[PDB]
């Protein structure tokens, strides 16, 4: 059919249409085992960290029900591609031009917008823009539930208010970059340990055990009690899903 379509005009101005949409769309298991052999508590799954509650024995241990991502801790770079990202939160596409991401899914960022709030990204769900604050590279510490980043001590109390025996998190001070703490709740009390950053860039709570990465810090301190009251048992999850206001991500003209 020899008809001439209205394909594309050219360069235009930016209008103000606030695209907004929500729906309950999450549920993915990218799950495995790492272990960390020592004392038990009273819970059931795979991975030799804490032995099972002796009433039920479906697998014999317990870790993967609380933290399956413990093998992504010392995974290093991503599975094959060093620039692969992962979804921190399950996010619903606000518009058609944005993308619905599932929590814990490995997705690919292509590039951020003018102010770096949103990125053209691709999931198994399709294509579209997703925000920085709902994703992170698989190379980072942020991909782990325990790492919350900018958290005041009161917000860490709030995080560990519903925390069990051995619950933990790493916070960084928004008011003091580089200064970090491990808030570990055990026996119904929240304790706070200093992550001392050595001059060359090493991390350590304890002066005796200095690691290259905070990943090795959490590993070594989840296997053994190394200056903690107990082993890093349960990672405290994220507190807030960051509220994004009225954004067209980059797309006014975007192809």
Curated annotation (Swiss-Prot):
Protein name, UniProt field: Tyrosine-protein kinase ABL1
Record: disease: Leukemia, chronic myeloid: A clonal myeloproliferative disorder of a pluripotent stem cell with a specific cytogenetic abnormality, the Philadelphia chromosome (Ph), involving myeloid, erythroid, megakaryocytic, B-lymphoid, and sometimes T-lymphoid cells, but not marrow fibroblasts. A chromosomal aberration involving ABL1 has been found in patients with chronic myeloid leukemia. Translocation t(9;22)(q34;q11) with BCR. The translocation produces a BCR-ABL found also in acute myeloid leukemia (AML) and acute lymphoblastic leukemia (ALL).
Modified residues (Phosphoserine): 69, 248
Tissues expressing this chain: Widely expressed.
Similarity comment: family membership: Belongs to the protein kinase superfamily. Tyr protein kinase family. ABL subfamily.
Residue positions where Phosphotyrosine is found in the record: 89, 134, 147, 158, 191, 204, 234, 245
Superkingdom, natural source: Eukaryota
Subcellular location: Cytoplasm, Cytoskeleton; Nucleus; Mitochondrion
Domain (SH2): residue spans on this chain: 146-236
Post-translational modification: Phosphorylation at Tyr-89 by members of the SRC family of kinases disrupts SH3 domain-based autoinhibitory interactions and intermolecular associations, such as that with ABI1, and also enhances kinase activity. Polyubiquitinated. Polyubiquitination of ABL1 leads to degradation.
Residue ranges annotated for the SH3 domain, each copy included: 80-140
Subunit annotation: Interacts with SORBS1 following insulin stimulation. Found in a trimolecular complex containing CDK5 and CABLES1. Interacts with CABLES1 and PSTPIP1. Interacts with ZDHHC16, ITGB1 and HCK. Interacts with STX17; probably phosphorylates STX17. Interacts with INPPL1/SHIP2. Interacts with ABI1, ABI2, BCR, CRK, FGR, FYN, HCK, LYN, PSMA7 RAD9A, RAD51, RAD52, TP73 and WASF3.
Function of the protein: Non-receptor tyrosine-protein kinase that plays a role in many key processes linked to cell growth and survival such as cytoskeleton remodeling in response to extracellular stimuli, cell motility and adhesion, receptor endocytosis, autophagy, DNA damage response and apoptosis. Coordinates actin remodeling through tyrosine phosphorylation of proteins controlling cytoskeleton dynamics like WASF3 (involved in branch formation); ANXA1 (involved in membrane anchoring); DBN1, DBNL, CTTN, RAPH1 and ENAH (involved in signaling); or MAPT and PXN (microtubule-binding proteins).
Signal peptide segment: none
Cystine crosslinks: none
């Amino acid at each position: 059919m020899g008809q001439q379509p209205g394909k594309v005009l050219g360069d235009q101005r930016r209008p103000s249409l606030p695209a907004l949409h929500f729906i309950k769309g999450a549920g993915k298991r990218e799950s495995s085992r790492h272990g960390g052999p020592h004392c038990n508590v009273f819970v059931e799954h795979e991975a030799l960290q804490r032995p099972v509650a002796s009433d039920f024995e479906p697998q014999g241990l317990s870790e993967a029900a609380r933290w399956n991502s413990k093998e992504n801790l010392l995974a290093g770079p991503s599975e094959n591609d060093p620039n692969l990202f992962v979804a921190l939160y399950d996010f619903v596409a606000s518009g058609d031009n944005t993308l619905s991401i599932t929590k814990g899914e490995k997705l690919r960022v292509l590039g951020y917008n003018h102010n770096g709030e949103w990125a053209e990204a691709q999931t198994k769900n399709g294509q579209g823009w997703v925000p920085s604050n709902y994703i992170t590279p698989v190379n980072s510490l942020e991909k782990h539930s325990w790492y919350h980043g900018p958290v005041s001590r009161n917000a860490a109390e709030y995080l560990l208010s519903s925390g069990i025996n051995g619950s933990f998190l790493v916070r960084e001070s928004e008011s003091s970059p580089g200064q970090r703490s491990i808030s570990l709740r055990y026996e119904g009390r929240v304790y706070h340990y200093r992550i001392n950053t050595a001059s060359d860039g090493k991390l350590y709570v304890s002066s005796e055990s200095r690691f290259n990465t905070l990943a090795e810090l959490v590993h070594h301190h989840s296997t053994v009690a190394d200056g903690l009251i107990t082993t890093l048992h349960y990672p405290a999850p994220k507190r807030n899903k960051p509220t994004v206001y009225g954004v067209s991500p980059n797309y006014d003209k975007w192809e």
